[PDB]
Amino acid sequence: MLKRVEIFTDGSCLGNPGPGGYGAILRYRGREKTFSAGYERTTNNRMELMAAIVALEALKEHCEVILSTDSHYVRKGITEWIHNWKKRGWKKADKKPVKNVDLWKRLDAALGRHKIKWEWVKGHAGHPENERCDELARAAAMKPKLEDTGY
């Protein structure tokens, strides 16, 4: 029986673009672990992706993950865009480079190390953990200590 883990994520800027942060929650056997970091300058989209990436890269072994996020950006990427992007050497249809390809590749690599069940949520309403992730993001964005070199 594989390890079952629940992951919740969210991320954003105090002002987009500008200071930003991510927030993630890993829950296993009724125990939760917080994840958060802030960047001097980034975008909402990047923070939305980073949250998922960091949470997944935290898993030290192959797990069954139930990732819940209200990020339309992440949803579209995983459901639709990533598939076509890889078939074109990570390029859009209109010849154009995939934005934040550095993060997308990183995410794609992390997803492959686990069996993931994506849960696209509408928003914070009815989703306590995701709202909490947003708060962790804000706190981090208020005192960012990292630089988003990929931005």
With contact defined as beta carbons under 8 Å apart, do 10 and 22 qualify? yes
Pick from 10, 78, 83, 2: nearest CA to 50: 10
Residue 112 annotated among the catalytic residues of the structure: no
Catalytic, out of 21, 38, 48, 148: 48
Packing angle of the helix pair 128-142, 44-58 (nearest 10 deg): 110
Catalytic, out of 20, 70, 114, 127: 70
Catalytic, out of 18, 108, 124, 131: 124
Q: Does 134 appear as a known binding residue?
A: yes
Question: What is d(CA 21, CA 23) in angstroms, rounded to the nearest whole number?
Answer: 7
Residue 11 annotated among the catalytic residues of the structure: yes
Residue 134 annotated among the catalytic residues of the structure: yes
Q: Does 148 appear as a known binding residue?
A: no
Residue 10 annotated among the catalytic residues of the structure: yes
Residue 70 annotated among the catalytic residues of the structure: yes
3 state SS of 35: strand
Q: Does 94 appear as a known binding residue?
A: no
Q: Does 102 appear as a known binding residue?
A: no
Going by the annotation, the residues of the binding site for Mg(2+) are 10, 48, 70, 134
Q: What is the set of active-site residues? A: 10-11, 48, 70, 124, 134
